[PDB]
RNA sequence: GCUAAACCUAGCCCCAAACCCACUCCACCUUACUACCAGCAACCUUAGCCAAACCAUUUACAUAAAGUAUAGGCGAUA
RNA sequence: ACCCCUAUACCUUCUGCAUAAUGAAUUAACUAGAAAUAACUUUGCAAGGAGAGCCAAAGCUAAGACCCCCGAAACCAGACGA
RNA sequence: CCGAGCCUGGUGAUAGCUGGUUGUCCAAGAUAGAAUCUUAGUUCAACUUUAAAUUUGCCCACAGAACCAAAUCCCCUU
RNA sequence: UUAAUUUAUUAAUGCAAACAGUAACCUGCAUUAAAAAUUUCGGUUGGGGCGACCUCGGAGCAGAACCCAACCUCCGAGCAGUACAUGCUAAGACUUCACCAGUCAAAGCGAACCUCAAUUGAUCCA
């Protein structure tokens, strides 16, 4: 009698669970709910990987 | 025309289009036509009647259109007395 | 609607027929995001009701 | 991998950790607070709604202060509650023309200051804001003590706010004989205020200047251990005695 | 969702008919939806392609195809061209025929 | 003090928190200097009569000038409180 | 038949949880690793590439409302 | 086996290359298509669908199925060099 | 290796330009034009591919398409 | 640099702001300088440069439905005149090979009893 959903079940990563996501959206999800509380260093690479991700998605691409 | 955005990763939408045109449900889209306003003075009676119509646009356009705004702008709406509601469902088509 | 509605059993016309009733009985779905301000009644089935 | 606690709460987490743990309630809690200060260089808002222009429709209107920078000649002296402006203009003020940087300062003047509470005559980098708050708040004394420690914006003016509390507290001898009842007269302007001795010696303190006086307070040379075997043993002699 | 009360008089106002009792000995059967209607729907593939589906029979399908076919001959003037699916128990009849279909299945008495 | 307006409209952000900025919500626009304005009268009780500018007892509105750097350090003149005002109207009872 | 080949376990990545480390003695801000003598002191908008097919204002840094109101060489986009 | 007859390497790039145009000694392992709307597909349910919000004049929920790699001269910020 | 050093970072800078872009097999498949800081590119058209719904499509014969050659258009039959 | 956009920096001035009397230094806003800074350097073209051209219209090339090029040959336009129902609406068509722009128009309502070949310019902003 549905107490609790299946997406309770699922156990891994605090951003992600229970959500599909793209590689971008990933990234996005994982500044906003883990951001603070990350290493300087993999924080940089994680905000360069966005700003990657965006260009690549936003512009450069086939389709547009 | 941002695929994903930055803080939602969501499509977003060409606000021009919405400025501009009119998306009746049917999948038309409805524009004002150019130069309706402008030099009327030395424009003709018949081509001041014809610029100041309510033109159709293309399907390759309406396409764009599509693509350029977000599935909000395509929803069903209810507005109490919208003179255009009428036009939104489409009637007595055959192909 | 609201007819088949009453054929159906759903929403009930020996009690008030609110519109919380209405949205029980799942006739008619309102959605005050997207700025829904409740329902408008309609003539479609003047006639036959 | 990740942190336990975010980064923006580790400030907050060493306080509750070592000697500023040992600080005393009261001081620590001034540090927490962190209340806006009253605007200065913008007009604010009056009403939190107010229905905008173009449409005719309400909708919320937040106030944000302008971000403020104060150089340490500020806080060596009393200007207002106020500083530089570092900011950036458009040319002509249209937006179509360059941008370019500006930095608005304040106008600093020199004045003498009398103060019935410390009985001497400062002389301070002060600005005409300042000095109209003070006339607002009638005394310069007054106006140290009504004027909160976020819109001071001074060390100086901190400090001397913190000198004014411990001389209500004691009741020091300020004027000395002859005027006693002179004295007694001023203490009475500011029955107000006047907070207990052991409050106002932390008063306008920075967070290291406190540390450093906790420190100090309970510095201490170590207590012989000889001195507390022979305190035992005593003890024990006693007890033997009793029984 | 309530099962609905009996009336007094069929069909009721806006043409609604429960089904039969005891019911129409076949080789098929058709069920009704949650909301106790008949389940012959329209469907629209490609902006031309219009059909419509009849996707609760049980049984013998075959059969039910082969009665639906026989209907739907005078009406055209050729057969429907229709696809069964077994799995699901449907029929996928090429061109907009439900009200009709509806019809013909209140008849029979499902 | 210098007033600055701001260009370019910051987003608006909750009740429990602030709102992040941009490089261009840096960029102000002048409003107004509390200097470049119509000066006030500050009003000062006299504890003595000075010149014609005033008489002993007397609440006179005066430059701010005149009330700062003369009057109020020499103790020729009070501000006008609440507290010591009731003081004076005894005073002049007691006269 | 020589050169060579081959080989699993060193360890490592992503998480989860949990808030870490830091004086045997001696030496170490003078030219650090130097046993031993009379002078100063920190705070001050990031920018630009880039996108706009140039470029000059401008160009992002739990869920849902919503890519909505807004903003914008009213365009890129935000 | 050869002798006989037949047969103008390969990729790229071209209107067109055996070209005397590019590249490539050879072996080794490494080394390049990633994303929505809208469609189509087949399921589920159906005047409703969805495990709130969204969409709905057959619709809606479901998955499946498309969108590369290497390369400047550069510009700017903060260090380091007589 | 100074027309403005070197190093790190922003920087996976950007490249309408060049080079490259990896299992098998089958199938359909060739270039009217438009604007365009545009002619080394691009959006629309045209051609092309797929899935659909369809009812005509090509080939065409009399009659017909202006005054100041070759043909074409149109066009029932077949 | 006498190209466009700026003066944030220095430059003095000028006005404020501060001050004093008697019948200067700072700060804010203006000013013209000096220094700089951000800058871009259109295309077509029998290579590029130089020269010429760049939008619109009529005739030839293109002889008989459309269409058709060159830095091919030749003429021209960037208005003028008359009205002031040069009102309002609206079936159905043409179309400069896309779109945008263009053209024509029965009936009706309301009134009487356009000429011209080109004669022109989107959006946003004002
Ligand atoms: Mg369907
Ligand atoms: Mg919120
Ligand atoms: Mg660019
Ligand atoms: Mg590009
Ligand atoms: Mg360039
Ligand atoms: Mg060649
Ligand atoms: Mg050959
Ligand atoms: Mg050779
Ligand atoms: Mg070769
Ligand atoms: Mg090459
Ligand atoms: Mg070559
Ligand atoms: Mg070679
Ligand atoms: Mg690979
Ligand atoms: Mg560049
Ligand atoms: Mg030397
Ligand atoms: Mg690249
Ligand atoms: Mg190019
Ligand atoms: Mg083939
Ligand atoms: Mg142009
Ligand atoms: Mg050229
Ligand atoms: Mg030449
Ligand atoms: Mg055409
Ligand atoms: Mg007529």
Redesign the pocket.
């Given at each position: 009698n549905?107490?609790?959903?299946?997406?309770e079940l699922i156990?891994?990563?605090?951003?992600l669970?229970?959500?599909?996501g793209?590689?971008?959206?990933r990234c996005?999800?994982?500044?906003?709910?883990?951001?603070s509380?990350?290493f300087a260093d993999?924080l940089?690479?994680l905000?360069?990987?966005?700003?990657?991700?965006?260009?690549?998605?936003?512009?450069?691409?086939?389709?547009? | 025309?941002?695929?994903?955005?930055?803080?939602?990763?969501?499509?977003?939408?060409?606000?021009?289009?919405?400025?501009?045109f009119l998306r009746l449900?049917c999948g038309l889209w409805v524009?004002?036509?150019?130069?309706?306003?402008?030099?009327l003075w030395?424009?003709?009676?018949?081509?001041?009647?014809?610029?100041?119509?309510f033109?159709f646009?293309?399907?390759?356009?309406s396409?764009?259109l599509?693509?350029?705004?977000?599935?909000?702008?395509?929803?069903?709406?209810?507005y109490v007395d919208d003179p255009y509601?009428?036009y939104?469902?489409?009637?007595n088509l055959?192909? | 609607?609201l007819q088949?509605?009453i054929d159906?059993g759903?929403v009930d016309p020996s009690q008030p027929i609110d519109l919380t009733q209405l949205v029980n009985?799942?006739?008619?779905?309102?959605?005050?995001?997207?700025?829904?301000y409740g329902v408008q009644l309609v003539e479609e089935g003047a006639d036959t009701f | 991998?990740?942190?336990?606690?975010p980064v923006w709460l580790?400030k907050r987490?060493?306080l509750?950790?070592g000697i500023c743990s040992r600080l005393p309630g009261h001081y620590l809690r001034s540090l927490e607070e962190e209340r806006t200060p009253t605007p200065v260089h913008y007009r604010p808002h009056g009403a939190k709604f107010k229905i905008?222009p173009?449409?005719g429709?309400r909708?919320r209107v937040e106030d944000v202060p302008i971000?403020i920078?104060?150089?340490?000649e500020s806080?060596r002296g009393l200007w207002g509650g106020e500083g530089?402006?570092?900011?950036?203009?458009?040319?002509?003020?249209?937006?179509?023309?360059?941008?370019?940087?500006?930095?608005?300062?304040?106008?600093?003047?020199?004045?003498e200051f009398y103060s019935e509470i410390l009985d001497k005559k400062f002389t301070v980098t002060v600005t005409?804001r300042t000095?109209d708050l003070i006339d607002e708040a009638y005394g310069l004394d007054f106006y140290i003590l009504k004027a909160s420690g976020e819109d001071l914006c001074s060390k100086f003016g901190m400090d001397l706010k913190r000198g004014m509390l411990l001389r209500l507290a004691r009741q020091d001898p300020q004027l000395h004989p002859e005027d006693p009842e002179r004295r007694a007269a001023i203490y009475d302007k500011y029955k107000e205020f006047a907070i207990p001795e052991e409050e106002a010696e932390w008063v306008g303190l920075?967070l290291?200047e406190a540390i450093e006086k906790q420190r100090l307070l309970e510095e201490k040379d170590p207590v012989p251990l000889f001195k507390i075997y022979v305190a035992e043993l005593i003890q024990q002699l006693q007890q033997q005695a009793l029984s | 969702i309530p099962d609905p009360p009996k009336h007094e008089h069929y069909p009721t106002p806006s043409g609604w008919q429960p089904p039969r009792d005891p019911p129409p000995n076949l080789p098929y059967f058709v069920?009704?939806?949650?909301?106790?209607?008949?389940?012959?729907?329209?469907?629209?593939?490609?902006?031309?392609?219009?059909?419509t589906?009849i996707?609760?029979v049980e049984g013998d399908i075959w059969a039910l195809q082969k009665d639906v076919e026989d209907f739907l001959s005078p009406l055209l003037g050729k057969t429907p061209?229709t696809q069964v699916?077994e799995?699901?128990?449907?029929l996928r009849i090429?061109?907009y025929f439900?009200q009709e279909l509806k019809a013909w299945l209140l008849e029979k008495g499902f | 003090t210098?007033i600055v307006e701001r260009?370019?409209?910051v987003?608006?952000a909750g009740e429990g928190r602030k709102p992040?900025?941009?490089?261009?919500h840096?960029?102000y626009k002048?409003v107004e200097?509390t200097?470049?304005?119509?000066?006030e009268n500050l009003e000062l009780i006299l504890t003595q009569s000075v010149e014609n500018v005033g008489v002993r007892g007397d609440l006179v509105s005066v430059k701010?000038?005149?009330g700062?750097?003369?009057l109020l350090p020499q103790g020729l003149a009070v501000y006008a409180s609440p507290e010591n005002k009731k003081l004076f109207e005894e005073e002049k009872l007691l006269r």
């Open positions: 549905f107490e609790k959903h299946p997406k156990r891994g990563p605090i951003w669970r229970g959500w599909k793209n590689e971008l959206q996005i999800r994982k500044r906003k709910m883990v951001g509380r990350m993999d940089h690479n905000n360069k990987r966005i700003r990657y991700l965006y260009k690549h998605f936003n512009r450069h691409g086939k389709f547009r | 025309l941002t695929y994903f955005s930055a803080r939602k990763g969501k499509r977003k939408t060409v606000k021009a289009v919405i400025d501009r449900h524009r004002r036509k150019a130069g309706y306003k402008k030099k030395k424009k003709t009676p018949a081509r001041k009647k014809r610029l100041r119509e033109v646009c293309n399907k390759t356009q396409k764009l599509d693509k350029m705004t977000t599935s909000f702008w395509k929803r069903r709406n209810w509601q009428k939104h469902d489409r009637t055959k192909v | 609607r088949y509605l159906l759903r009985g799942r006739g008619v779905t309102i959605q005050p995001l997207k700025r829904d | 991998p990740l942190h336990k606690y580790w987490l060493q509750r950790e905008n173009k449409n429709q909708e971000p920078y104060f150089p340490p806080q530089w402006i570092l900011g950036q203009i458009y040319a002509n003020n249209d937006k179509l023309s360059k941008r370019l940087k500006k930095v608005w300062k304040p106008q600093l003047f020199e004045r005409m000095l920075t290291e | 069920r009704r939806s949650r909301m106790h209607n008949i389940p012959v729907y329209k469907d629209i593939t490609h902006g031309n392609r219009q059909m589906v996707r609760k061209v699916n799995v699901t128990g449907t090429k061109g439900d | 210098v260009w370019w409209k987003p608006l992040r900025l941009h490089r261009r840096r960029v002048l200097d200097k470049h304005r119509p000066k701010k000038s005149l700062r750097n003369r």
